[PDB]
Design a protein around this ligand. Structure first.
Ligand SMILES: *[C@@H]1O[C@H](CO)[C@@H](O[C@@H]2O[C@H](CO)[C@@H](O[C@@H]3O[C@H](CO)[C@@H](O)[C@H](O)[C@@H]3O)[C@H](O)[C@H]2NC(C)=O)[C@H](O)[C@H]1NC(C)=O
Lengths: 34, 48
């Protein structure tokens, strides 16, 4: 398998004032649990 | 006037006004285009 975001580390924002907050548990941490 | 690049500044380009941070780009504008837009209805870039 728009909005402000940030990856890595580089960030970007949009004039619409919308974003998405990160999870506490990253994919790696989940993989560790499983 | 002159302008400051890579800084939050108030702009008033002939026919275009607003605020933001102006940075150089490589968008393949056509000879008959002045400015472009994002997927949303907001100005994305302008030709000086
Ligand atoms: C926030 O912005 C600053 C700069 O405005 C970013 O810091 C800069 O990050 C690069 C990459 O880690 C640092 O190294 C540079 O790499 C290029 C690669 O060719 C090289 O040509 C440069 O001479 C330099 O080595 C750069 O030094 C660094 N600048 C400073 C002042 O530390 C920072 O990453 C940005 N952070 C986010 C979250 O956007």
């Amino acid at each position: 398998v728009q909005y402000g975001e940030c990856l890595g580390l580089i960030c970007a924002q949009k004039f619409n004032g919308l974003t998405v907050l990160p999870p506490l548990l990253t994919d790696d941490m989940i993989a560790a649990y499983t | 006037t002159d302008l400051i690049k890579n800084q939050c500044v108030n702009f008033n380009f002939n026919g275009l006004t607003g605020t933001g941070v102006l940075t150089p780009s490589s968008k393949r504008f056509q000879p008959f285009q002045q400015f472009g837009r994002d997927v949303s209805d907001f100005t994305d870039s302008v030709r000086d």
